[PDB]
Amino acid sequence: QSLGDEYSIAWSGSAYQEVSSKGAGAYAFVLGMIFVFLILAAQYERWLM
Amino acid sequence: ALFLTRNESKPFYFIQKFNDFFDWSTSVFSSGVAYILKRTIRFVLVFCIM
């Protein structure tokens, strides 16, 4: 709003990491949850437990 | 398998008293878990509240 077509925004450090974050952490957490579910189901020989 | 043996009784009075206390606590916990099992819906609702 304040600067238009004369100033370009940029990010550094933590802000740059947040801007360029690929969200791989949540995807990995979902994968781990699924793997834990599967391994427990294998141990108990039942999907529900 | 090597070190553990069959204890020849002779329990110390403190370790014996603590053993009876833990047995009483185990019985109390069994009573409580029977209670919560008999009341199977209230406690899952409590879990949702938690």
Binding site: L31, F35, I39, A41, A42, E45, R46 | -
Partner: protein, 50 residues
């Protein structure tokens, strides 16, 4: 008896299947795709301007 053990436990075979499938999905996501096996000799370009 390797195969016999899994038939007794269908859930074990199924869970191995799903584990392999998710591992393959992860691999396909991670791997790059490319036209042909790269046989272009690595090149270094030097440029000067007079």
């Amino acid at each position: 008896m390797f195969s016999k053990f899994f038939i007794e436990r269908p859930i074990f075979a199924s869970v191995v299947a799903i584990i392999i499938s998710i591992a393959g999905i992860i691999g396909l996501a991670n791997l790059p795709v490319e036209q042909y096996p790269s046989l272009t000799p690595p090149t270094v370009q030097v440029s000067a301007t007079y």
